[PDB]
């Protein structure tokens, strides 16, 4: 639990922190891709009209 | 950095991910390619007289 | 220690997959996008 910031030490193990970092970065990348996909689908066919 | 070492480290468990993925895409390709063939070779129902 | 990180990961990933499938199916069946037929 040394790698975890002491704020989140009660919650995150040493290994759980690295997997949490991977999950966070994956969620952020997926969010960017989702925003791009939504902008493209809107420029193509607006669903709200 | 993993939480499922029996699923992502061990060769038998690691293999199960690829097995599931390949089976899902195999079933989807099965259904999709069948319906593609059926709809491309089948003639349109004859126009009503 | 409450809330195992593994549990949150499983729940979030399954919720995201289920929601992606549900939203795709709702959008495809709506025919606003016409199952991509256009």
């Amino acid at each position: 639990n040394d790698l975890v910031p002491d704020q989140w030490k009660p919650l995150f193990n040493n290994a759980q922190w690295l997997v949490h970092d991977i999950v966070v970065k994956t969620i952020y990348g997926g969010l960017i891709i989702a925003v791009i996909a939504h902008v493209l689908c809107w420029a193509w066919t607006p669903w709200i009209r | 950095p993993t939480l499922f070492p029996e699923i992502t480290n061990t060769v038998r468990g690691r293999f199960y991910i690829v097995a599931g993925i390949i089976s899902v895409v195999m079933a989807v390709a099965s259904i999709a390619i069948f319906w593609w063939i059926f709809y491309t070779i089948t003639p349109a129902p004859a126009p009503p007289l | 220690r409450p809330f195992e990180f593994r549990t949150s990961v499983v729940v979030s990933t399954l919720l995201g997959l289920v929601m992606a499938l549900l939203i795709h199916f709702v959008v495809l069946s709506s025919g606003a996008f016409n199952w991509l037929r256009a």
Binding site: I22, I33, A37, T45 | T8, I17 | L36
Partner: peptide, 26 residues
Amino acid sequence: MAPFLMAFFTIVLIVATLYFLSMIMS
């Protein structure tokens, strides 16, 4: 633009799969 988008989303699916399976298969 629908064929463009379907191809786009399938390749994003595939590349996502190569990335995280690469990690799992590390």
